Symmetry: C2
């Protein structure tokens, strides 16, 4: 499996409040977080706490990935809520998170998210959005109806997806998808080398205006 | 520093729902949990989740021990609440926990608890109860007003205590203190060898009736 990850502040925002992590050692899990300097702290806490929770508990709990991912996400949630106290006027910081946890065999991806960061799967020039955005509109802009850093955290969406060789998975913040249509994203995911695809996605988000922080993780199965 | 820990089912109860852990490698933290086979699972989850949270985050967070201990305890709380779902009719399991986290220097003890398990400090033949039991009566039997395994977890008491050479710390479940008065506990803590003191405390709890599971951790500073 090949994986590439890239974050970019984009062409308009002053700071990058997105964060990501790839388990480069074992390629088991992948995390993107879009914060809202409260946002930087929230996305960093989410990525670090989800990463550490998964590192610590993966051996013990990979047989129950939904419990593992819920507890990782709640560990992150609590950590953000504790920093909200004092802590100060970072009162309201929050972050999205999207996580892929691969099973040991590597052909099942547990997709977990809170917010409007996305997971997509690409296959043979067709792209599918896997996560459903936690926005009031997607519910049927708002924007967010759910984020990490709330005592009122009400939903952690988790679903498995089975994978085939040659599939790609994309974790992205909305800085990608507010600039690039899915049709455009799909073309860049067709680039064989995932490092080039990741860079091309970011570069295209910027070519198209880059109005937000943009983060991608591209995984080729 | 010398530490000894012992748990015993006692002379009446059928199973031991107490649990404990000593960081024998680095002597940084010590945990006793009294569960209420839901109780066994709750105390095991609390000890393991507090232990793992502290192992993972101690380097990063020992400079903010109250945040570290609150997040360790909430990690445990959440893990118990997730097993309550399904999980099944273990619906109501809960556990006390008492934790000592020593600072690096080893002469300050952060005492954290939920329930009616206790931390005591002994010095020069005098004993002091440090934690205040979360029972309705102590509030002014009930018994518990607080335990881990509640969505409604409302209190995690945490306080530091400074230590002198020759002090002893005792973590115990109420199986000790419902059989032995503090005057009696104090005498056994005067035993120089902490392994002998721990064994003597348990043995005395049983001599006096042993009506409950009894767990002690004895630390000589
Ligand atoms: Ca943002
Ligand atoms: Ca019990
Ligand atoms: Mg958005
Ligand atoms: Mg964004
Ligand atoms: Mg009691
Ligand atoms: Mg008891």
């Amino acid at each position: 499996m090949d994986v590439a990850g890239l974050t970019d502040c984009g062409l308009i925002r002053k700071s990058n409040q997105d964060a990501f992590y790839i388990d480069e050692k074992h390629q088991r899990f992948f995390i993107v977080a879009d914060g809202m300097a409260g946002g930087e702290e929230a996305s960093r806490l989410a990525v670090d706490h989800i990463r550490q929770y998964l590192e610590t508990h993966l051996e013990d709990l990979q047989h129950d990935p939904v419990t593992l991912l819920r507890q990782a996400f709640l560990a992150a949630n609590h950590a953000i809520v504790e920093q909200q106290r004092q802590n100060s006027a970072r009162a309201d910081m929050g972050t999205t998170a999207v996580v892929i946890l691969l099973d040991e065999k590597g052909d099942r991806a547990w997709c977990a998210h809170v917010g409007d960061s996305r997971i997509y799967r690409w296959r043979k020039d067709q792209l599918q959005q896997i996560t459903s955005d936690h926005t009031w509109i997607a519910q049927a802009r708002h924007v967010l109806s759910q984020c990490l850093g709330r005592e009122d955290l009400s939903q952690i969406d988790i679903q498995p997806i089975d994978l085939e060789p040659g599939d790609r998975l994309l974790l992205c913040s909305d800085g990608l998808t507010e600039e690039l249509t899915d049709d455009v994203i799909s073309i860049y995911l067709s680039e064989p080398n995932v490092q080039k695809a990741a860079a091309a996605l970011v570069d295209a988000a910027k070519t198209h205006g880059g109005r937000d922080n943009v983060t991608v993780v591209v995984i080729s199965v």
